[PDB]
Structures are given as C-alpha cells and as structure tokens.
Amino acid sequence: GSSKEVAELKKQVESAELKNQRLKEVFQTKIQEFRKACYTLTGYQIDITTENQYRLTSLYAEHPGDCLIFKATGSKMQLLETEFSHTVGELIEVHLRRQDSIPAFLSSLTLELFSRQTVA
Amino acid sequence: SKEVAELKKQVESAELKNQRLKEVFQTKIQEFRKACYTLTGYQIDITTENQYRLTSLYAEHPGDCLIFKATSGSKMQLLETEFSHTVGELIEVHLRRQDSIPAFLSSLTLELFSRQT
Numbered sequence: 001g002s003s004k005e006v007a008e009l010k011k012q013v014e015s016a017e018l019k020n021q022r023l024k025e026v027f028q029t030k031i032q033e034f035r036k037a038c039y040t041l042t043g044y045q046i047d048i049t050t051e052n053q054y055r056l057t058s059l060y061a062e063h064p065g066d067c068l069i070f071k072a073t074g075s076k077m078q079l080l081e082t083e084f085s086h087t088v089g090e091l092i093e094v095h096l097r098r099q100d101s102i103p104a105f106l107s108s109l110t111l112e113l114f115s116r117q118t119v120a
Numbered sequence: 121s122k123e124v125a126e127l128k129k130q131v132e133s134a135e136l137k138n139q140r141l142k143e144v145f146q147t148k149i150q151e152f153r154k155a156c157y158t159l160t161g162y163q164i165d166i167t168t169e170n171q172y173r174l175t176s177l178y179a180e181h182p183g184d185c186l187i188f189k190a191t192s193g194s195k196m197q198l199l200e201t202e203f204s205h206t207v208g209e210l211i212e213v214h215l216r217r218q219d220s221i222p223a224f225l226s227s228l229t230l231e232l233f234s235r236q237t
Contacts, residue, residue, distance in 0.1 A: 009127035016134035027145035031152055037172050040196055042160040043222025054155055077158055103161025103177055104233050107226035114223050
C-alpha cells in the first residue's frame with residue numbers, strides 16, 4: 001500500500017539524518033578553521049591521527065611527509081619518533097628535553113626550517 | 121504496522137544521536153584548541169570581524185595579547201594592542217623585513233621564554 005503516514009515518517013527520518021550530517025559539518029568546519037588559523041600564524045598544521053596522536057607539519061617542511069608526532073600523556077605531550085624527528089636530535093635535546101618546553105622546541109624548529117626554505 | 125514501528129525507531133535513534141554528538145563535538149573542539157596551545161605556546165580565540173586573539177603561554181601580564189585579522193581567510197594582518205606596542209623590534213625584524221608571522225611568533229615565544237628564563 002501507499003500509507004500516507006509511512007511516507008511522512010520517511011521524510012521525518014530523512015530530516016533527522018540530514019540534521020545530524022549538518023551537525024557533523026559544523027564540527028568539521030570549526031576544527032578546520034582553527035587548524036587553518038594555527039597553521040597560518042604559527043606555521044604548524046596540527047592534525048589528529050588514526051591512533052589519536054597529533055601530527056604536526058610545518059609550513060616550511062623540506063620534504064613531502066616530514067612531520068612530528070606528539071601523543072597526550074591532555075595537558076602533557078610526549079614526542080614520538082619519526083623519520084623527521086631523528087634528523088632534528090639537537091633541537092630536541094636543546095629545547096624539548098633540556099629547556100623542557102614544547103613551544104620553545106617548535107619555535108626553534110620553525111626558525112631553522114624557515115632559514116632552510118630561503119637558501120639558494 | 122511493522123514499518124511504522126521501524127521508522128519511528130529510526131527517528132528516535134537519530135534524535136538521541138544528535139544530542140550525544142553535540143556533547144562530544146563541543147568537548148573535542150575545546151580539546152583541539154588546548155592541544156594547539158600546549159604545543160605552539162599560543163592560545164587562539166576566534167573572534168568577530170575575522171579576528172584571532174592570541175595569548176602566549178609565557179605572557180608576562182594578564183591581558184597581554186596579540187590580535188590578527190584575516191583580510192577575508194588566508195592573508196593575516198597584525199592589529200595593534202597595548203602588548204604589540206612593546207615588541208616593535210620583533211615586528212620590524214620578522215613582519216616588516218621577513219613577512220613571516222610564523223617567524224615572528226616563534227621569535228616572540230623564545231623572547232618571552234627568556235624573560236622568565
């Protein structure tokens with residue numbers, strides 16, 4: 001049959017599902033806006049990995065795929081090793097380990113990469 | 121009659137999900153902002169008229185902040201605050217001469233860190 005009630009319920013379902021999709025979109029948009037502002041201003045694109053780590057990529061990265069990974073231990077972060085991080089052992093020692101400051105470390109790294117970016 | 125029951129169930133399930141998603145999206149957005157702060161040393165507030173207020177982890181005085189404005193946005197301009205008026209040299213070196221906000225904010229983070237260090 002062609003129940004009017006059934007047809008209207010289908011429309012209620014469609015509307016409810018669309019509403020949830022809109023909610024997801026607003027969330028994604030908010031995160032992306034924040035990410036874009038952080039990337040533009042600080043020079044780091046901050047992504048969330050499949051394993052709930054944070055993947056940082058520099059605006060001035062030398063090569064495709066160069067990144068740092070940090071994992072929360074949320075107020076505290078620990079660096080995980082990457083191809084790229086093994087190449088910046090000294091910045092890590094000086095700033096991340098010895099000064100005990102992630103911001104000093106990332107700040108120093110941004111300045112070093114920026115310097116490398118303009119070599120010619 | 122079965123179908124009526126099923127669709128009703130689907131409506132209720134989607135509404136429940138709506139309420140629960142609102143909750144977890146809200147907390148996640150806050151967690152992301154806080155992570156950016158913990159890592160970069162800047163707390164970013166998104167404000168009206170396409171502006172971003174940034175506060176350093178190493179700010180010396182409550183209220184010290186920087187305000188940036190997007191021309192749309194991609195291109196950012198530093199607006200003036202009482203605090204920006206105290207870092208003229210950093211502005212000159214990294215914004216005027218290098219045109220790099222990331223170099224500016226990175227250098228500022230190291231300067232403020234040195235002031236407590």
